[PDB]
């Protein structure tokens, strides 16, 4: 199993999530953050480094689906602009839903 | 060491923070998200997002099944949408007053 | 690869960042949380008050960085971070398995640099 936290432009929530479900994905946590990345907060084009809004989705997955939502994301995201977004995939040992106690793959499942 | 997430429902922060507390878990952060699960947040094809919390609890090891217990048994009810609980691992824990590493950042006194 | 995530205290964060920037250390992601440690949010401390339990407002700082640059790290966010007093914060390092830029689709060291 795998989490997938990507952190992408605000406006591009809508696309993103629909493909990741057109795809098959079944669950996903978002919340809003700040941040910079290599060009500290700056768009235009003094070191005065800003932070900008961005969205955090945090989906987890099965190890076989993962080139799949980073796929998705990288198609719904991508603009060609700086500040486009970042995405960090880490283990994950185990998964529990917790209404039912189903673990792991069952945990991750559909409805 | 071991991080817990558990995503569950905001109003249920209380009875998880009594149940992890009285059972000797102190240490806790807790955010604002939004998500859903496999009803795509329906509570009745649109897919919406709803409000929850998510806790993070880093621990030993040899306290991970009982902090999945107490939020399991804080936070299950048997409505869908209770929540979903995630493991993961740390290799590194460091108390920033102090210096102190892993073992010694996690536990009390 | 690391996730470096650090619970601070809020006023703390632009010298934590100064402190990180200069060092070369350009990328990090910033959120509002709330917690408590093992004082369970209280400065000041009652006889049968160890099973009340408040939350404080901190923030949560996360930084991706390559396995030989954790050390950097740590250093600058404690050195930026300590005040001396109970609640200065927490940091959690975790593996990362890949890091990709979505502007390029370039992966990890160069995803990180
Ligand atoms: N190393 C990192 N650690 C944690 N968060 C990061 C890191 N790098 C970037 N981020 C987060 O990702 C968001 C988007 O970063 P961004 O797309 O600017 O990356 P970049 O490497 O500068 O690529 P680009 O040159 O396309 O802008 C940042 O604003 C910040 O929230
Ligand atoms: N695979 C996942 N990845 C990341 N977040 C998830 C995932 N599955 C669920 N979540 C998050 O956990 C919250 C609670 O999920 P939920 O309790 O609805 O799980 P479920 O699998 O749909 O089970 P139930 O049938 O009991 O509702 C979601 O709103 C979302 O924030
Ligand atoms: N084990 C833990 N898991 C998850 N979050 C924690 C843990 N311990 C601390 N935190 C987070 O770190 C923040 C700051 O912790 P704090 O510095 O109070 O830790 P402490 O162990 O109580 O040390 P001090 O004795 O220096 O207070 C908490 O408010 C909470 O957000
Ligand atoms: O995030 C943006 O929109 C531009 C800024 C950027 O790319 C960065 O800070 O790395
Ligand atoms: O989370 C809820 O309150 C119900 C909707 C749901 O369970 C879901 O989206 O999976
Ligand atoms: O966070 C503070 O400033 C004091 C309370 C504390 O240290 C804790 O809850 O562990
Ligand atoms: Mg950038
Ligand atoms: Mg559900
Ligand atoms: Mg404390």
């Not at 057109?22 to 953050?33: D, F, H, K, R």
């Not at 290599?38 to 689906?65: C, H, M, N, P, S």
């Amino acid at each position: 199993m795998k989490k997938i936290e990507a952190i992408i432009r605000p406006f591009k929530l809508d696309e993103v999530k629909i493909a990741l479900v057109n795809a098959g994905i079944v669950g996903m946590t978002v919340s809003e953050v700040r941040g910079f990345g290599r060009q500290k907060g700056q768009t235009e084009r003094e070191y005065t480094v800003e932070f900008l809004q961005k969205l955090k989705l945090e989906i987890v997955v099965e190890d076989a689906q993962v080139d799949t939502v980073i796929d998705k994301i990288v198609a719904a995201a991508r603009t060609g602009e700086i500040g486009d977004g970042k995405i960090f995939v880490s283990p994950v040992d185990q998964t529990i839903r917790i209404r039912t106690g189903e673990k792991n793959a069952d945990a991750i499942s559909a409805w």
